[PDB]
Amino acid sequence: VETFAFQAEIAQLMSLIINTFYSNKEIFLRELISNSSDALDKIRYESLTDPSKLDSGKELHINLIPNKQDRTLTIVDTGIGMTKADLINNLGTIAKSGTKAFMEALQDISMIGQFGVGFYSAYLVAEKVTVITKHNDDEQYAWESSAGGSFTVRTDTGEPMGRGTKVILHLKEDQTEYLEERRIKEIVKKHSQFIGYPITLFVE
Amino acid sequence: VETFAFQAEIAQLMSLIINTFYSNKEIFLRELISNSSDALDKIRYESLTDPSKLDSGKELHINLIPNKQDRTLTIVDTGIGMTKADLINNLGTIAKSGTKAFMEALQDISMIGQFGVGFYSAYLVAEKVTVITKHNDDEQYAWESSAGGSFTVRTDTGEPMGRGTKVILHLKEDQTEYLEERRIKEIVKKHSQFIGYPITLFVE
Numbered sequence: 236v237e238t239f240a241f242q243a244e245i246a247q248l249m250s251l252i253i254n255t256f257y258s259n260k261e262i263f264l265r266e267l268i269s270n271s272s273d274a275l276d277k278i279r280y281e282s283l284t285d286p287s288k289l290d291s292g293k294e295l296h297i298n299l300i301p302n303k304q305d306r307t308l309t310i311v312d313t314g315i316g317m318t319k320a321d322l323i324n325n326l327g328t329i330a331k332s333g334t335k336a337f338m339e340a341l342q343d344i345s346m347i348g349q350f351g352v353g354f355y356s357a358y359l360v361a362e363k364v365t366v367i368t369k370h371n372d373d374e375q376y377a378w379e380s381s382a383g384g385s386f387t388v389r390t391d392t393g394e395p396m397g398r399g400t401k402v403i404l405h406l407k408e409d410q411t412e413y414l415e416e417r418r419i420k421e422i423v424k425k426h427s428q429f430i431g432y433p434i435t436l437f438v439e
Numbered sequence: 440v441e442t443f444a445f446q447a448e449i450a451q452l453m454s455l456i457i458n459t460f461y462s463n464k465e466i467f468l469r470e471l472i473s474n475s476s477d478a479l480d481k482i483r484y485e486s487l488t489d490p491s492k493l494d495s496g497k498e499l500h501i502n503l504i505p506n507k508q509d510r511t512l513t514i515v516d517t518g519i520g521m522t523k524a525d526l527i528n529n530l531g532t533i534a535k536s537g538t539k540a541f542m543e544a545l546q547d548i549s550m551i552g553q554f555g556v557g558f559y560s561a562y563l564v565a566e567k568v569t570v571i572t573k574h575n576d577d578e579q580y581a582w583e584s585s586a587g588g589s590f591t592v593r594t595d596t597g598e599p600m601g602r603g604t605k606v607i608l609h610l611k612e613d614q615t616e617y618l619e620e621r622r623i624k625e626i627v628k629k630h631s632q633f634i635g636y637p638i639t640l641f642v643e
């Protein structure tokens with residue numbers, strides 16, 4: 236297990252998100268879904284030129300998996316995934332410029348999507364986030380952070396995913412509404428209704 | 440015809456775009472298409488609760504119209520459109536915040552879309568941009584700017600368009616490749632292939 240400090244601007248952003256009240260928290264799910272759709276576009280695109288890109292799974296979809304007993308909500312997709320270098324250095328699209336711009340605006344949280352840093356909105360509702368991912372060019376890895384300025388990265392030895400990403404939200408005790416069938420369905424209807432990939436809720 | 444000053448940060452960004460060399464200019468079309476898709480999502484959403492929103496036209500689509508005689512490329516959609524207030528005040532999601540820090544990041548251009556000011560990438564290729572638009576709640580208007588720090592807004596008495604927006608790019612003399620069928624086809628393929636509305640490229 237390797238532990239890393241966040242980029243300064245990312246540490247800054249995560250604290251602002253965690254330590255300030257924001258009403259319109261439900262947008263975290265829009266952001267996670269939007270990320271999944273983007274990752275699905277990227278693998279689909281690659282597969283046009285080279286169909287073997289889909290040897291790791293042909294299906295292109297997004298699954299929402301609430302678990303009341305674990306108090307986790309997990310957003311799963313069969314997108315391009317992330318390599319170890321992605322998990323350590325962050326994605327090219329997440330520049331300190333997008334971050335800095337956003338924080339200044341903050342001081343609606345929904346504008347977070349605009350700036351490439353939508354993932355961090357998960358920390359509106361979750362005390363810990365685990366990201367398990369498999370990119371065609373790399374091994375399966377787990378990235379995890381409870382915020383507080385650091386994250387971890389390890390090779391993942393669990394269940395194989397073929398290709399794609401699972402984002403596991405370990406929810407805060409006052410944010411269990413996001414585990415409810417009715418609530419998840421209304422959020423998807425309001426913010427993610429025209430996403431070009433099937434979104435399936437795994438009812439408990 | 441009313442003439443308005445640009446927001447200082449928008450005026451600065453437009454100067455940067457016009458007066459700086461950038462290589463990967465084709466991304467202007469991805470940005471215009473993205474905006475059209477977003478405008479279409481918006482009217483489609485409103486129609487779900489109120490079918491009469493589509494009295495101004497039920498078809499939800501995007502047209503690309505090269506004109507080699509006029510040296511214009513026109514991006515048309517049947518999306519929600521913009522009101523006169525939108526044309527004067529700008530859109531709520533275009534704010535100095537996303538603008539100011541993006542310029543700093545510059546000093547690839549493709550990062551523009553992820554700061555909510557993707558429209559202005561049109562000035563990479565166009566010496567003037569005319570925007571004709573019709574929203575359910577307003578009259579038809581023409582917005583136009585050749586940059587230099589100002590824009591114009593007037594009623595458009597011309598061809599009644601139903602609902603939606605036309606973005607007319609009056610291309611620079613050295614940017615006429617964007618009128619060629621093959622070039623437009625290839626740009627849509629690389630960047631807008633999975634947009635969830637029909638994109639129709641007109642033949643000349």
Ligand SMILES: Cc1cc(C(=O)NC2C[C@H]3CC[C@@H](C2)N3c2ccc(C(=O)NCc3ccccc3)cn2)c(C)cc1C(N)=O
Pocket residue numbers: 443444445446447449474475477478516518519520521525526527528529530533558570582604606
């Ligand atoms: C979704 C969409 C968005 C756009 C877009 O970005 N529209 C804009 C509003 C209009 C038309 C083009 C440009 C940006 N516009 C403006 C309008 C006003 C201003 C402005 O600076 N106004 C003065 C101001 C001063 C001080 C503070 C704020 C504004 C700048 N750009 C466009 C052009 C089309 C679509 C579409 N296909 O539906």
Ligand SMILES: Cc1cc(C(=O)N[C@H]2C[C@H]3CC[C@@H](C2)N3c2ccc(C(=O)NCc3ccccc3)cn2)c(C)cc1C(N)=O
Pocket residue numbers: 239240241242243245270271273274312314315316317321322323324325326354366378400402
């Ligand atoms: C498209 C997509 C994007 C994301 C996402 O935004 N991923 C990130 C990469 C990983 C996993 C979560 C978070 C942001 N991550 C990181 C990684 C590194 C860092 C970081 O700060 N690293 C140190 C650093 C120091 C100095 C300069 C640059 C980096 C921050 N966030 C995720 C989690 C999933 C998807 C998806 N469904 O495919």
